[PDB]
Prior knowledge:
The structure is cut from a larger assembly and holds chains A and B.
Chain A: E1 2-8, E2 15-19, E3 27-48, E4 59-61, E5 77-81, E6 87-88, E7 91-92, E8 101-106, E9 119-137, E10 140-147, E11 153-156, E12 159-163, E13 176-180, E14 183-186, E15 203-204, E16 214-215, E17 220-221, E18 233-234, H1 239-246, H2 251-254, E19 260-262, E20 267-269, E21 275-281, E22 296-305, E23 314-322, E24 326-332, E25 337-339, E26 343-346, E27 351-358, E28 362-369, E29 372-379, E30 387-388
Antiparallel strand pairs in A: 1-21, 2-3, 3-9, 3-20, 4-8, 5-8, 6-7, 9-10, 9-13, 11-12, 12-21, 13-14, 15-16, 17-18, 19-20, 22-23, 23-27, 24-26, 24-28, 25-27, 28-29
Chain B: E1 10-14, E2 17-22, E3 28-33, E4 41-45, E5 49-54, E6 60-64, E7 70-74
Antiparallel strand pairs in B: 1-2, 2-5, 3-4, 3-6, 6-7
Amino acid sequence: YEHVTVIPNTVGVPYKTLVNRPGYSPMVLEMELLSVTLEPTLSLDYITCEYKTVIPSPYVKCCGTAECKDKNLPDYSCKVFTGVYPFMWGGAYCFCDAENTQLSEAHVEKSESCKTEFASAYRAHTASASAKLRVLYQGNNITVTAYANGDHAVTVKDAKFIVGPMSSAWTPFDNKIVVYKGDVYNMDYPPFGAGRPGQFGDIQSRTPESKDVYANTQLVLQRPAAGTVHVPYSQAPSGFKYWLKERGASLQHTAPFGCQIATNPVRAVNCAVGNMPISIDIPEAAFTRVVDAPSLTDMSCEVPACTHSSDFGGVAIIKYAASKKGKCAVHSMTNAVTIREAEIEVEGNSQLQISFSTALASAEFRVQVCSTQVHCAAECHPPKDHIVNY
Amino acid sequence: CRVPKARNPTVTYGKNQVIMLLYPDHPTLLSYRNGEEPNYQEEWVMHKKEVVLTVPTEGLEVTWGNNEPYKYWPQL
């Protein structure tokens, strides 16, 4: 028998489902999404890190004029300064008084730190939802790990499970994402070859092993000081270093629905977006016939204690008169209240105690023990703590 | 890199809100977030300060220094 139900995509919340196979005693299954993982498919656009302003020794051409050649290097800057007369510790470096030139050279490549300290620019698309659903099956807890695509059958104790497809294809992630160590950021990063100076992407490397890198760093070479050998320049400071302090709080702290964000691989854990359909093909052996199950008669219900809250603040005592000894399923016929126990051992002319959760001050609910219903009248009082820590 | 932690503040609750009496011995980072709109906010607490934070139905996560984040939810 195939039982089809839909639960919200919320981790750590046990849900009760009533399995009613015609001509067979009702079955109550408790389902809880241990952990919900939303892993998006990533496509690496580029890597960014701190750049390296590579300034070699300046070419001081004594008694001659130096010539700047166009070099294919990121942020390549070249300038020849005339009327230079530089000095070293033991006097002037050039023989000539006039006609000496200084060629200043500079370019921006990946720093030695790029293998250790780096941010990755990814294209996030179509998140794959996965979740191991703890199932209270035959008085025992069973763990089912399946792809939430609706096309992955996992069989545990002869019961076939088909999880999903997810109602929402989203995930605390936009189309463009940025990853730094254990932190993920939603960022509309500039494309490769479009990075601005002093900003994220001032230096762009397609892969961390890449030889040719893109560079756009406002590098402007200045005229050296009188009688001084040095390469003065005006620039834009590291965009990656600037982003490291300007990034703000990561998705782990800003994402709605209490999403937990993890890396390697990047994923959204325990979020609250959309619902999850569940299909359970329960084998014939698990079911017990109505005649084989005890018959419930002369039922009465009393509520000695009730508090309307998120947890099981309600207590109900149900008196019964059972035809034989056996296991009976407990289920609330009113959607306003939920019962903690799924199965109880029935005896004879005895009574049972159940724990229930409700938000209503005046709780009117029907409890189905095996195949017979009993009305419960409850006057539930407000909780003491307005805020709870679960 | 090894680090330390601060002390747990005296917590008092109200209707859809949490009240914390912060007693820091040194500068301590106080951060908090909500659901779909997290609305991340942060402040460095230097001395004795009382903080009133709104707890939405979706829940509120509060991080006080090097301590593990505190989670708050309203009662139904």
